[PDB]
Ligand binder design. Sequence first.
Ligand code: HEM
Ligand code: HEM
Ligand code: HEM
Ligand code: HEM
Lengths: 141, 141, 145, 145
Amino acid sequence: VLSAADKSNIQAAWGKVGGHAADYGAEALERMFLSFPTTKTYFPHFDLSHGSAQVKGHGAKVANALTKAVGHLDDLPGALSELSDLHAHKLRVDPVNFKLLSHSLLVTLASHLPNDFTPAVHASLDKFLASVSTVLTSKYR
Amino acid sequence: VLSAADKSNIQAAWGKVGGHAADYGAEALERMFLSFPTTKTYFPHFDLSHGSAQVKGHGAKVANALTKAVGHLDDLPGALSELSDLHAHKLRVDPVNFKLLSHSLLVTLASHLPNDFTPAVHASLDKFLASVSTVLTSKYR
Amino acid sequence: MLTAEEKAAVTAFWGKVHVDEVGGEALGRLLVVYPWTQRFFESFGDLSTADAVMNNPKVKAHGKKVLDSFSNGMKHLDDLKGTFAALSELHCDKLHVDPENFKLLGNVLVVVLARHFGKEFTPVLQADFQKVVAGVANALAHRYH
Amino acid sequence: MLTAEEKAAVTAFWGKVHVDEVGGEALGRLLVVYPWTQRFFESFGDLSTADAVMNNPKVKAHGKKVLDSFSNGMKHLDDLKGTFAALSELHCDKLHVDPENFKLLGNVLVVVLARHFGKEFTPVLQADFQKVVAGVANALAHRYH
Ligand code: HEM
Ligand code: HEM
Ligand code: HEM
Ligand code: HEM
């Protein structure tokens, strides 16, 4: 449902991110956990302290998935098939927690891309993350 | 995306409305205005008291657009083309208000059709109203 | 925010509600309609389909307790925060339920009241109970504040 | 509900902030990213394009007044309810702004501060400011409760 205008804003932003993707994903996770303590209950098997190997590694996994998504903006339901099952059916992740991570991600991107994070680019990235969130919350019981 | 798995519940429940669509639309509007006062400010050209022909007439329009949506579940973006622009551009309706009208609509349907309003049909009408609301908020530029 | 008038009609109507039935159905409808809420009820056994959820005896036993708490709130409309302080502790600090779900369950309770009482659950009466569910949802979310 | 540690860190951070530069950006991004918010700002003139909004003289002056209210809030972190009492009356009783948008503007402000302050806006410090924005959004919504 995303516009061509949004897609090219998203593609350009993530292209700038480049090989920083995994580092920024780990950052976004830390900002989520510290800003929103409720989200920590999803990761009790994790050491959640700063610079932990598990948050680092999980940050890389999340960023990888967003790279995959950025490349399939015409078909997110199709491309995030296994992740939708994981998040909706198996893990039963509360949809508000997607808004929380989404916000964390935007904070991280703004922090690192201050020149390229225009109002227009901000709005397109918010729509992209809301669109991914919808797919990940689409296949519950 | 609305699931095709939901269509049979949607068409069955909504089919029970029938000649009551305009009375149920009006009721739902009234339940919205009374439970959620912030919604009244969209309608300062209305008398919003019980029995007002404006709420009656408007309740009919809402109901009738939902009826058309029920007959175009494969293409809700297309069916609601003109309503999309009106609500999102001219009217600037805050997305959260669609949730409040959607709740008001489920309350109305539960009261009037208690037997048709099963747990599964409830869930399908929730996804239907959430899909409708997505389309009507989709043109914000 | 409940006026004296809003209190008395809400209170008069409440006496009619069987809360064995209404509590079970509301908690069941929460789990069916918003299936992420099932995360918090692993230990309740089978929750796979609408029928399994609704007819689950743990779901019905737990829904009874939920509505027993609402019945308690109804008795203390001028002090919901103090009334639910123990439940806020549990839901927020022990269970970390996102507070948005407290509104959702309140809303579902309203739907169930409408289904059960139809004609009697008028627009005015429903409006009053929305103030109550708003009140309960906030009292429960207070430990986050 | 901040700790003494969080209160001191966030108040120290706020003092450094050039509000004039931040306020207008925050409100501009609000109007651009969440366009329905424009409903409340029709007296402000040209809001047609992103550059119109970002460069609108009234948007800039209003944003500064918004941040000034945060600056006051910063001095009364344990009485945000009283501090924002009249502003809650304006936003709820007169404007009827849905309270979800109080969170949205706070969140937009956080994003703007990150854009400006980069790695200095640390995960801890941003977390501290999120509790401030959560607290302020609640206090503004109080007239609804
Ligand atoms: C932008 C949205 C998100 C994306 C792209 C994403 C992506 C991923 C990926 C790639 C995995 C690993 C899957 C695998 O390789 O097996 C994963 C796992 C997981 N995710 Fe997410 N996720 C998102 C949102 C969330 C949210 C909001 C939460 C909860 C706060 C969450 C909780 C989890 C949990 C608990 C796991 C399992 C990790 C483990 O057991 O080691 N996810 N996610
Ligand atoms: C399920 C979602 C909704 C549907 C199906 C719907 C349907 C309609 C229809 C058919 C019209 C008349 C269009 C015309 O004259 O061309 C209309 C107008 C209007 N709608 Fe909605 N609407 C929805 C949600 C909302 C919400 C949530 C609000 C605000 C609380 C709202 C506010 C208005 C207003 C202010 C008008 C014009 C009023 C008038 O002059 O009669 N709508 N809507
Ligand atoms: C209006 C909102 C709610 C009320 C009044 C309420 C009430 C209650 C009551 C009475 C108990 C039993 C505590 C005891 O007597 O020992 C309880 C426990 C519990 N609540 Fe709620 N509740 C609400 C919302 C929620 C929501 C939305 C969820 C999650 C989606 C939730 C999850 C739980 C869980 C997991 C337990 C413990 C269950 C067990 O393992 O025994 N509650 N609550
Ligand atoms: C963090 C949340 C918010 C804060 C701290 C805040 C702060 C303020 C303050 C301090 C004023 C008074 C300025 C003066 O006295 O001149 C004001 C006015 C106003 N606010 Fe907000 N506000 C918030 C959220 C919002 C939102 C979300 C909207 C709209 C969607 C909004 C719409 C308005 C409007 C229309 C005015 C009057 C503007 C005028 O005509 O001069 N506010 N706000």
